Design a protein around this nucleic acid. Sequence first.
DNA 1: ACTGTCATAAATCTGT
DNA 2: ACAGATTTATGACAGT
Length: 104
Amino acid sequence: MAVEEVIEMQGLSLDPTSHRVMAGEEPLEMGPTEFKLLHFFMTHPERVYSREQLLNHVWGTNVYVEDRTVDVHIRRLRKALEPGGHDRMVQTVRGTGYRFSTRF
DNA sequence: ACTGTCATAAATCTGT
DNA sequence: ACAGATTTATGACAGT
């Protein structure tokens, strides 16, 4: 089928059709760049991504900003998932980039 | 209201 | 153990 389908993993559920993020069946709220970065991470758990890979996928290939736009948006995404208990999935690889994980 | 940039603090790696 | 160089986290502000 071509209709989109909800992703539910480790108590966190994201619906691409409704643009709706919920943790433990209680909603969380975020902007659309934050949602797209979260959608990219939840479709790719257990892989390391540099700020360049995140820029080409989420912001766009021919779109231009500094690398440290990613750092501020990572803080905004963690701040958003923090009262939902799910900031700790979003992990940091020093000197390279970031990684998303179920636990470890 | 949402995203991009800068400033300062904390954290990491290597050399002595 | 401490200092210097490089990276990352956080808070405030501007532009559109």
